[PDB]
Amino acid sequence: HGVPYFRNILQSETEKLTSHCFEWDRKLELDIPDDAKDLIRTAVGQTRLLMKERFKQFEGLVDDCEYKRGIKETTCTDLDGFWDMVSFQIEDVIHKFNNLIKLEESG
């Protein structure tokens, strides 16, 4: 793999998660039941937490691999493993989005 691949997939993931965020907050305006409101709120907040905390630090690690600046050196395979551990959480959050969609289509 290569580093532009990392940047491209990174921006793609941020874009899709933020699109989910906007549609969630736009749909929250209706008087959906409080349980659904809480679930949607938790989902968008967890997505934003991954945004600010996970993704910013992870792009810091991309900078680490690119400019070779920081504590110690890092290779591309470490970046791949990092994308795997982000990836299980992204699959999780899209699954939560799926269940929110299922609840919305039920009411």
Partner 1 sequence: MREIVHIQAGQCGNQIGAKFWEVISDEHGIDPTGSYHGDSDLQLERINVYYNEAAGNKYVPRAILVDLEPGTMDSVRSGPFGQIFRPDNFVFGQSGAGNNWAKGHYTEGAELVDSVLDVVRKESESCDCLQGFQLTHSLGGGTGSGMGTLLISKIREEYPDRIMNTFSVVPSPKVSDTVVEPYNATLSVHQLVENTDETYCIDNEALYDICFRTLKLTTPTYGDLNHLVSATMSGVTTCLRFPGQLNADLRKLAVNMVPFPRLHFFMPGFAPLTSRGSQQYRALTVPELTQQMFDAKNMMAACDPRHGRYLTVAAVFRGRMSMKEVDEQMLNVQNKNSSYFVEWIPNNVKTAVCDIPPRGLKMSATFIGNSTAIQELFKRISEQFTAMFRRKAFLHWYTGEGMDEMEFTEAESNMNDLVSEYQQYQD
Q: Is 6 in the site for partner 1 (CB under 8 A)?
A: no
- Rounded to whole angstroms, how far apart are CA atoms 41 and 33? 12
**Binding track over 31-70 against partner 1, x by CB under 8 A:** -------x--xx--xx--xx--xx--x---x---------
Q: How far is the CB of 84 from partner 1 (least distance, A)?
A: 5
- Rounded to whole angstroms, how far apart are CA atoms 58 and 11? 12
Element (H, E) at 53: none
- Rounded to whole angstroms, how far apart are CA atoms 39 and 10? 25
Q: Is 81 in the site for partner 1 (CB under 8 A)?
A: yes
For residue 78 the two structure tokens come to 């470490």
Residues making contact with partner 1 (CB under 8 A): 38, 41-42, 45-46, 49-50, 53-54, 57, 61, 72, 74, 77-78, 80-82, 84-86, 88-89
